[PDB]
Design a protein around this ligand. Structure first.
Ligand SMILES: Cc1cn([C@H]2C[C@H](O)[C@@H](COP(=O)(O)OP(=O)(O)OP(=O)(O)O)O2)c(=O)[nH]c1=O
Ligand SMILES: Cc1cn([C@H]2C[C@H](O)[C@@H](COP(=O)(O)OP(=O)(O)OP(=O)(O)O)O2)c(=O)[nH]c1=O
Ligand SMILES: Cc1cn([C@H]2C[C@H](O)[C@@H](COP(=O)(O)OP(=O)(O)OP(=O)(O)O)O2)c(=O)[nH]c1=O
Ligand SMILES: Cc1cn([C@H]2C[C@H](O)[C@@H](COP(=O)(O)OP(=O)(O)OP(=O)(O)O)O2)c(=O)[nH]c1=O
Ligand SMILES: Cc1cn([C@H]2C[C@H](O)[C@@H](COP(=O)(O)OP(=O)(O)OP(=O)(O)O)O2)c(=O)[nH]c1=O
Ligand SMILES: Cc1cn([C@H]2C[C@H](O)[C@@H](COP(=O)(O)OP(=O)(O)OP(=O)(O)O)O2)c(=O)[nH]c1=O
Ligand SMILES: Cc1cn([C@H]2C[C@H](O)[C@@H](COP(=O)(O)O)O2)c(=O)[nH]c1=O
Ligand SMILES: Cc1cn([C@H]2C[C@H](O)[C@@H](COP(=O)(O)O)O2)c(=O)[nH]c1=O
Ligand SMILES: Cc1cn([C@H]2C[C@H](O)[C@@H](COP(=O)(O)O)O2)c(=O)[nH]c1=O
Ligand SMILES: Cc1cn([C@H]2C[C@H](O)[C@@H](COP(=O)(O)O)O2)c(=O)[nH]c1=O
Ligand SMILES: Cc1cn([C@H]2C[C@H](O)[C@@H](COP(=O)(O)O)O2)c(=O)[nH]c1=O
Ligand SMILES: Cc1cn([C@H]2C[C@H](O)[C@@H](COP(=O)(O)O)O2)c(=O)[nH]c1=O
Ligand SMILES: [Mg+2]
Ligand SMILES: [Mg+2]
Ligand SMILES: [Mg+2]
Ligand SMILES: [Mg+2]
Ligand SMILES: [Mg+2]
Ligand SMILES: [Mg+2]
Ligand SMILES: [Zn+2]
Ligand SMILES: [Zn+2]
Ligand SMILES: [Zn+2]
Ligand SMILES: [Zn+2]
Ligand SMILES: [Zn+2]
Ligand SMILES: [Zn+2]
Lengths: 140, 140, 140, 140, 140, 140
């Protein structure tokens, strides 16, 4: 079932993300296997999504990461994430890892990141916080 | 009443924030003047808060901004932030401004930032997004 | 966006439904485009899903329709469906149409059923109730 | 207390059900003895309740069973039924038994059905599913 | 329908209230005619209900009014009473009228009190607050 | 942390209570240290707060105690108080103690009342109910 939700997350990113280079999605799943929240990378709701705003490097001033978006969207909708799992198409960055912990998510399910030395430091900080704060990491 | 909640936010930061240099808090207030969520700057819940982890520059690897924390805490608790106002002791950074929009908060109430040219760019991006996405900014 | 959610519904049915002949799913979507509930056709939760129980005609004694399941699952989870839309891979039967009305769903989005005279009566009753009770039907 | 709620269910059916032959009601009660949801047999909300539509056999095209209605009404209102008990004036049919399981109700309290051979098969299927899926049946 | 709910309230009081002299109940009904909360007069939950504690005048040290109980029970269960109506077997006392206003209830439905000069002052204060604060009073 | 919330309660009363003699506030805090509800002593919402209505003895006809207000406000907002703690600037009166029990609050945190023989009876009844019903009292 974890793999089926991961497959759905991949499809979500392909269908909904407007990023022209890299589409990312995350599903927050509760203990009854209900989809509590969905995030995908994008610009803020209602912000005019011009071609110029989605080019690099300009898009980084406006874009929201998928996992951050899943959490912020749950706050908007008033959906409780404490105890849930997050199934994401990309292992979280350092800042999203903090928000994952703060939202009460207890488990991250994703694929193993490709070896990239520029991300080793960030990856190490995320896993240090996850290990200490009780967040399980499961790689498909 | 906005000023009374801002006063309470200042007291919240002084009482609860462990940052040795700068304490920050934010109250998310609904349309019935109920406190929907509180954030303050800090390390993730349960992360060992050693002296070394709170020193600069190391603390930036672990710290969560107050306004981000208010939103992530609402997602943990399942509290609906759509339509609420956020009363904060510090005008939000560019990334927290994105999360504020995504959480459905409609209004930011704070004090006017001091002139700081290193923050002009960030301040301009936050206000560009707020203006376009319908977030009112009110300075006390 | 309606077509993207319909595509996801089709994928949901293919991934999760255990019916060996016909897989059905339905997504209940709220006015902020959040997935409030998912249903797919299946046997009751925890009921032993033997090969014999999934054969015809025996499976009809135990199977739950996808749209009924979406509504019953929302009641289990305490998710409010009033005002939502249901995007389904199959136009609802007469009994599911009643439950759709009772759950407060205001709109059915699906594909146009193929001409089948054995279902004309049922289809006519569903649309009579939908028309009178204020449920919009939209065909992709 | 179970008998007092059953008495109230009987009164609910007599007061609210428009069926001219048989009035049915069900109360879904949580573990704090709060009434989470009420169902009674009837036509869909807002459907014109003409004399012709309530005659037999025409009414079966439009009527909703009380226990199904209790569950669909909870989905409309966003009331969590997981772990609740359902106190009903009539033992559930095969289809309502499926929905009871799917809604997370853990216990059915009613009176013992009168001997009726035409319902033996249905009664046997309901109890087979209840026994296997963990639903307790208590007869007053 | 208001009269049918009032009839149910009377039955609730007769079935559940342990007061040996006067049994009182109140139903808080939302705009979809769902029973949001029930109160009846009684001693606090789990307090040993001895014969001595239910005698007069001792019982007044421990008893909770039905309408107060309906509101406190909703707070325990987390049920939103804003905009609801309260259907009560007895017109509220001065203190319960305050709590009714504070809970967001917008309408009181009951029977007309019998002429009792010892209650004229209290009745006048309740209606002064109701009139000014926007609470409609409807007598059956 | 209990003392920090008590300090905030004192500030809440000073900022928001309009009583010219004695300002009272109470914070209901959940097990994640989120502020579930706030009460302070005052007149009903929207009632014209004239100088005459706030004088003694007239104000007692209209005023609501802080702890009662915290509970009634939670019912208005639909916030679950079961299992929470109430941190109050004043030990509850006999009637508020009943409502505290009925709302599911499990713990009262306040300062020790000053010796006042006119309140001994009331204080004794509150503590008798708290002891029997499982409410812990903690004095700072
Ligand atoms: C609906 C939805 C949006 N989001 C995020 C993605 C984007 O950053 C932002 C808005 O999504 P968009 O798909 O951009 O939607 P929009 O409301 O901006 O409308 P439009 O199609 O006209 O652009 O919110 C989620 O993370 N989860 C959701 O379920
Ligand atoms: C309780 C609470 C915490 N937070 C944030 C602040 C911190 O970053 C984090 C945890 O707060 P801390 O005060 O650090 O609490 P803790 O659970 O880590 O316990 P301890 O006192 O032993 O350290 O969550 C909020 O933003 N709002 C809240 O209401
Ligand atoms: C999780 C889930 C289940 N259902 C329905 C489908 C089935 O009829 C029933 C249970 O789904 P199943 O996929 O059968 O899951 P299960 O809990 O029975 O476990 P197992 O995999 O061991 O069989 O609930 C939904 O409609 N929506 C949902 O989101
Ligand atoms: C209010 C309510 C309705 N129902 C069901 C019964 C019916 O099938 C349907 C609507 O109930 P009805 O009593 O028919 O109410 P209505 O909204 O159709 O209005 P009218 O009196 O003009 O007919 O919903 C419940 O199961 N539980 C409830 O609490
Ligand atoms: C269940 C319930 C209780 N109450 C009130 C009535 C009483 O004052 C108090 C508890 O109700 P009681 O009927 O006394 O129940 P209890 O939990 O004390 O158990 P026992 O039967 O052993 O005495 O809560 C409501 O107002 N509404 C409700 O829905
Ligand atoms: C907002 C709020 C009010 N209350 C109580 C205090 C008062 O008795 C009542 C209303 O509070 P007031 O501060 O009087 O507010 P109001 O809505 O009457 O507006 P105004 O300032 O014009 O008078 O509700 C709480 O207990 N908690 C809360 O969080
Ligand atoms: C690194 C990272 C990027 N993203 C988003 C930001 C951008 O929209 C996109 C990456 O764009 P890029 O591949 O052109 O650099 O993916 C996430 O959602 N999460 C992450 O962890
Ligand atoms: C800039 C900024 C900092 N903070 C936090 C991060 C740090 O804990 C602290 C600033 O530390 P510093 O003053 O030593 O740089 O304030 C916020 O919460 N929000 C903000 O917008
Ligand atoms: C007709 C219908 C069937 N179904 C389910 C029941 C069965 O599991 C399956 C149909 O099986 P069949 O194609 O072998 O008859 O689809 C629905 O979920 N909704 C419907 O409206
Ligand atoms: C068999 C059954 C019927 N009903 C309803 C449907 C009809 O409105 C009524 C039975 O009508 P009848 O007695 O004329 O056949 O009771 C239920 O609510 N639940 C059941 O389990
Ligand atoms: C006056 C009043 C009494 N009651 C309760 C308190 C007692 O249990 C009972 C009255 O008892 P009595 O008739 O012996 O005086 O009714 C309410 O619930 N609401 C009210 O408004
Ligand atoms: C005794 C008591 C008073 N109060 C309020 C009622 C009045 O507004 C105020 C007391 O006014 P006083 O000090 O002039 O008598 O405090 C509470 O909120 N809780 C209590 O337990
Ligand atoms: Mg957009
Ligand atoms: Mg900490
Ligand atoms: Mg199964
Ligand atoms: Mg009707
Ligand atoms: Mg009792
Ligand atoms: Mg006022
Ligand atoms: Zn990230
Ligand atoms: Zn920030
Ligand atoms: Zn169907
Ligand atoms: Zn049935
Ligand atoms: Zn009263
Ligand atoms: Zn009091």
């Amino acid at each position: 079932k974890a793999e089926k939700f991961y497959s759905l997350a991949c499809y979500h990113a392909q269908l909904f993300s407007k990023d022209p280079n890299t589409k990312v999605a995350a599903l927050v799943i509760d203990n009854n296997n209900n989809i509590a929240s969905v995030g995908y990378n994008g610009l803020p709701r209602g912000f005019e999504e011009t071609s110029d705003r989605w080019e690099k490097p300009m898009k980084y001033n406006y874009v929201v990461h998928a996992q951050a978006n899943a959490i912020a969207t749950a706050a908007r909708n008033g959906v409780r994430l404490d105890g849930c799992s997050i199934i994401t198409t990309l292992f979280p960055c350092k800042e999203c890892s903090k928000l994952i912990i703060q939202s009460g998510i207890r488990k991250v399910i994703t694929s193993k990141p490709c070896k990239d030395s520029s991300w080793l430091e960030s990856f190490s900080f995320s896993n240090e916080m996850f290990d200490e704060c009780g967040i399980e990491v499961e790689y498909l």
